[PDB]
Design an enzyme around this catalytic site. Structure first.
Site, PDB file in Angstrom:
ATOM      1  N   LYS A  37       0.864  -1.177   0.000  1.00 54.36           N
ATOM      2  CA  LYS A  37       0.000   0.000   0.000  1.00 54.36           C
ATOM      3  C   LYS A  37       0.900   1.225   0.000  1.00 54.36           C
ATOM      4  CE  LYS A  37      -3.488   0.588   2.761  1.00 54.36           C
ATOM      5  NZ  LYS A  37      -2.952   1.564   3.721  1.00 54.36           N
ATOM      6  N   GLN A  93      -6.734   6.150  15.852  1.00 58.05           N
ATOM      7  CA  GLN A  93      -6.544   4.779  15.358  1.00 58.05           C
ATOM      8  C   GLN A  93      -6.675   3.790  16.476  1.00 58.05           C
ATOM      9  OE1 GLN A  93      -6.911   2.885  13.057  1.00 58.05           O
ATOM     10  NE2 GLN A  93      -5.074   2.438  11.871  1.00 58.05           N
ATOM     11  N   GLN A  94      -7.308   2.674  16.150  1.00 60.07           N
ATOM     12  CA  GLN A  94      -7.463   1.566  17.058  1.00 60.07           C
ATOM     13  C   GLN A  94      -6.879   0.323  16.447  1.00 60.07           C
ATOM     14  OE1 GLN A  94     -11.605   2.124  19.217  1.00 60.07           O
ATOM     15  NE2 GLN A  94     -11.944   2.316  16.993  1.00 60.07           N
ATOM     16  N   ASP A 126     -15.317  11.500  -3.801  1.00 55.72           N
ATOM     17  CA  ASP A 126     -15.872  12.666  -4.490  1.00 55.72           C
ATOM     18  C   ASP A 126     -16.887  12.162  -5.492  1.00 55.72           C
ATOM     19  OD1 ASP A 126     -16.085  15.405  -5.483  1.00 55.72           O
ATOM     20  OD2 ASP A 126     -13.977  15.663  -5.023  1.00 55.72           O
ATOM     21  N   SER A 180     -11.438   1.786  10.946  1.00 58.93           N
ATOM     22  CA  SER A 180     -10.833   1.308  12.192  1.00 58.93           C
ATOM     23  C   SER A 180     -10.765   2.373  13.267  1.00 58.93           C
ATOM     24  CB  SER A 180      -9.403   0.875  11.910  1.00 58.93           C
ATOM     25  OG  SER A 180      -8.656   1.875  11.316  1.00 58.93           O
ATOM     26  N   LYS A 204      -7.963   7.613  -0.411  1.00 58.40           N
ATOM     27  CA  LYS A 204      -9.347   7.157  -0.195  1.00 58.40           C
ATOM     28  C   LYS A 204     -10.305   8.043  -0.997  1.00 58.40           C
ATOM     29  CE  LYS A 204      -7.972   4.885   4.011  1.00 58.40           C
ATOM     30  NZ  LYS A 204      -8.041   3.404   3.641  1.00 58.40           N
TER      31      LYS A 204
HETATM   32  C1  LIG Z   1      -7.419   2.865   4.569  1.00 55.90           C
HETATM   33  N1  LIG Z   1      -6.735   1.822   4.054  1.00 55.90           N
HETATM   34  C2  LIG Z   1      -7.652   2.843   5.955  1.00 55.90           C
HETATM   35  C3  LIG Z   1      -8.943   2.663   6.440  1.00 55.90           C
HETATM   36  C4  LIG Z   1      -9.175   2.556   7.788  1.00 55.90           C
HETATM   37  O1  LIG Z   1     -10.289   2.352   8.262  1.00 55.90           O
HETATM   38  N2  LIG Z   1      -8.153   2.555   8.658  1.00 55.90           N
HETATM   39  C5  LIG Z   1      -6.908   2.758   8.195  1.00 55.90           C
HETATM   40  O2  LIG Z   1      -5.945   2.754   8.993  1.00 55.90           O
HETATM   41  N3  LIG Z   1      -6.592   2.871   6.837  1.00 55.90           N
HETATM   42  C6  LIG Z   1      -5.228   3.145   6.354  1.00 55.90           C
HETATM   43  O3  LIG Z   1      -4.412   2.010   6.695  1.00 55.90           O
HETATM   44  C7  LIG Z   1      -3.166   2.440   7.260  1.00 55.90           C
HETATM   45  C8  LIG Z   1      -2.992   1.732   8.603  1.00 55.90           C
HETATM   46  O4  LIG Z   1      -1.687   2.177   9.044  1.00 55.90           O
HETATM   47  P1  LIG Z   1      -1.154   1.886  10.552  1.00 55.90           P
HETATM   48  O5  LIG Z   1      -0.981   0.389  10.664  1.00 55.90           O
HETATM   49  O6  LIG Z   1       0.133   2.589  10.567  1.00 55.90           O
HETATM   50  O7  LIG Z   1      -2.171   2.439  11.528  1.00 55.90           O
HETATM   51  C9  LIG Z   1      -3.285   3.898   7.572  1.00 55.90           C
HETATM   52  O8  LIG Z   1      -2.183   4.670   7.104  1.00 55.90           O
HETATM   53  C10 LIG Z   1      -4.610   4.387   7.023  1.00 55.90           C
HETATM   54  O9  LIG Z   1      -4.414   5.440   6.104  1.00 55.90           O
HETATM   55  C1  LIG Z   2     -16.845  18.997  -2.940  1.00 55.92           C
HETATM   56  N1  LIG Z   2     -16.730  20.336  -2.888  1.00 55.92           N
HETATM   57  C2  LIG Z   2     -18.028  18.520  -3.513  1.00 55.92           C
HETATM   58  C3  LIG Z   2     -18.954  17.880  -2.702  1.00 55.92           C
HETATM   59  C4  LIG Z   2     -20.201  17.523  -3.220  1.00 55.92           C
HETATM   60  O1  LIG Z   2     -21.107  17.021  -2.520  1.00 55.92           O
HETATM   61  N2  LIG Z   2     -20.484  17.757  -4.502  1.00 55.92           N
HETATM   62  C5  LIG Z   2     -19.604  18.332  -5.322  1.00 55.92           C
HETATM   63  O2  LIG Z   2     -19.856  18.579  -6.527  1.00 55.92           O
HETATM   64  N3  LIG Z   2     -18.328  18.738  -4.850  1.00 55.92           N
HETATM   65  C6  LIG Z   2     -17.356  19.269  -5.759  1.00 55.92           C
HETATM   66  O3  LIG Z   2     -17.798  20.478  -6.283  1.00 55.92           O
HETATM   67  C7  LIG Z   2     -17.529  20.646  -7.667  1.00 55.92           C
HETATM   68  C8  LIG Z   2     -18.846  20.717  -8.423  1.00 55.92           C
HETATM   69  O4  LIG Z   2     -18.463  20.979  -9.771  1.00 55.92           O
HETATM   70  P1  LIG Z   2     -19.582  21.114 -10.950  1.00 55.92           P
HETATM   71  O5  LIG Z   2     -20.284  22.459 -10.739  1.00 55.92           O
HETATM   72  O6  LIG Z   2     -18.747  21.166 -12.179  1.00 55.92           O
HETATM   73  O7  LIG Z   2     -20.491  19.953 -10.800  1.00 55.92           O
HETATM   74  C9  LIG Z   2     -16.655  19.474  -7.999  1.00 55.92           C
HETATM   75  O8  LIG Z   2     -15.291  20.018  -7.744  1.00 55.92           O
HETATM   76  C10 LIG Z   2     -17.008  18.401  -6.978  1.00 55.92           C
HETATM   77  O9  LIG Z   2     -15.807  17.648  -6.811  1.00 55.92           O
END
Ligand SMILES: *C(=N)c1cc(=O)[nH]c(=O)n1[C@@H]1O[C@H](COP(=O)(O)O)[C@@H](O)[C@H]1O
Ligand SMILES: *C(=N)c1cc(=O)[nH]c(=O)n1[C@@H]1O[C@H](COP(=O)(O)O)[C@@H](O)[C@H]1O
Lengths: 257, 257
Positions: free
Chosen positions: B59, B208-209, B95, B150, B92
């Site tokens: 990852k 974090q857990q 959007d 988590s 993650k």
């Molecule tokens: C995304 N993979 C994610 C989702 C989540 O619920 N929890 C989570 O920790 N992660 C990502 O996984 C790594 C875990 O790293 P550690 O073992 O150092 O805590 C973390 O960097 C999150 O971004």
């Molecule tokens: C984030 N600002 C976001 C959240 C959301 O619920 N809906 C959404 O469209 N956005 C962002 O806003 C613009 C919308 O652009 P358009 O006018 O071209 O649809 C876009 O940057 C989305 O990522």
């Protein structure tokens, strides 16, 4: 009783970033945020310069810029200062606190080093805010929490939205408002920014849904409209930005009575 | 009614990327994903090379890599091919569809060009998956949906989790599994990857857990453990990785009967 943007800017509990924004909104008569998800820096800078007078905020998409450099962001900040608008980076931060901290401060983009505002999802729990604020507070930044989304099938409803509001309330040193479709907080110190806005009814082919400036500002009580394609895809972007500004502004005035 | 990884690789509805992963898991006796949130390319590559034999997946955190280039990713691909592991980018995605499509395909990072796997949050509704799919489908990429988190205060519970499972089912040409804390789907074609894992009880200072490999794989029925700090913070990262590998693998074997 509804307060003007200028009055809200002066509220005792207002965050400095929110105050700066509110003041320039009132000065320039604009509650429009332009979303510019362009692939070239030159495009970004050109749009920022041409439309800067019409906007209170520019929402950047650093993750989409093919030719990002920190020098581009230096120049963007110069434009922002000249035309008086804030910079809001779009990236919807959505990770555990330890990771989002790094994503905000570091990498090639160093988002915290140039974005006045960022937005974050609340799905991870409050650690997402705590992580971001550890970077944002020293750098004098603000954050918006995504309380509702504009897209079809959004899960940011009901108890989820209420959680976002509580998280915001509890982190007011850093959180300055919401991305939402409507007013979600009763506290005037919080901003409401609403994407999914176009003058005409419709959507896109990937789940976006649109409402009008009058609907979201006037009827739904939001503060600021975020518009991307409604402006950028227009033949005349200047005129389009003016049309959206006038719409949003009049809807605000009407509500204000 | 438990099947080996090798048998699961042969399931009728299995995605090619999933089958590839399940085969190398079986061959190498590893169900460990290393999360490498390092700031330097040289460290990333040294970890990938040394730990490659011990992991089924790496990852990456491209948003945190200070010296990212596409040449770095070329070298990582070489290592992935040599040692036989998949590349999973951490970002993650969260959007609207139109925006995540561009975030995945474009910018400086061009994530889709080098990542086997990506993960997405389901909060925006299924458009998030549709957008990613439009880019990743022909590249033989897969996507994991974040069904549970988590971290303390996670809102990915209850009906939210159920929505993630339904979304996966409805997009099985592209969605290959989940980020979750436990088995969320009874369908053996789906992979379950679980972060928040360490050998020792605890957490961090930012929500974090941690749970053990034995708990996550053996009792909660997950497939793969994702471990960052538990390995990265060790003096000897290789020895650490081996400990995690053995824990997760033996927990898997035991549930298999
Ligand atoms: C995304 N993979 C994610 C989702 C989540 O619920 N929890 C989570 O920790 N992660 C990502 O996984 C790594 C875990 O790293 P550690 O073992 O150092 O805590 C973390 O960097 C999150 O971004
Ligand atoms: C984030 N600002 C976001 C959240 C959301 O619920 N809906 C959404 O469209 N956005 C962002 O806003 C613009 C919308 O652009 P358009 O006018 O071209 O649809 C876009 O940057 C989305 O990522």
């Amino acid at each position: 009783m509804e307060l003007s943007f200028g009055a809200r800017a002066e509220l005792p509990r207002i965050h400095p970033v929110a105050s700066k924004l509110l003041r320039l909104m009132q000065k320039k008569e604009t509650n429009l945020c332009l979303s510019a998800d362009v692939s070239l820096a030159r495009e970004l800078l050109q749009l920022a310069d041409a439309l800067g007078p019409s906007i209170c905020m520019l929402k950047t998409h650093v993750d989409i810029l093919n030719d990002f450099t920190l020098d581009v962001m230096k120049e963007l900040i110069t434009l922002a200062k000249c035309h008086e608008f804030l910079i809001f980076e779009n990236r919807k931060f959505a990770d555990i606190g330890n990771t989002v901290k790094k994503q905000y401060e570091g990498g090639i983009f160093k988002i915290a080093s140039w974005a006045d505002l960022v937005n974050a999802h609340v799905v991870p729990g409050s650690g997402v805010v705590k992580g971001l604020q550890e970077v944002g507070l020293p750098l004098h930044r603000g954050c918006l929490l995504i309380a509702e989304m504009s897209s079809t099938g959004s899960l940011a409803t009901g108890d989820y939205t209420r959680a976002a509001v509580r998280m915001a309330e509890e982190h007011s040193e850093f959180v300055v408002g919401f991305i939402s479709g409507s007013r979600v907080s009763m506290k005037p110190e919080f901003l409401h920014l609403t994407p999914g806005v176009q003058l005409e009814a419709g959507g896109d082919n990937l789940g976006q849904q649109y409402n009008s400036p009058q609907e979201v500002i006037g009827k739904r009580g939001s503060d600021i409209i975020i518009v991307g394609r409604g402006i950028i895809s227009a033949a005349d972007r200047l005129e389009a930005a003016e049309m959206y500004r006038k719409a949003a502004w009049e809807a605000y005035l009407s509500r204000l009575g």
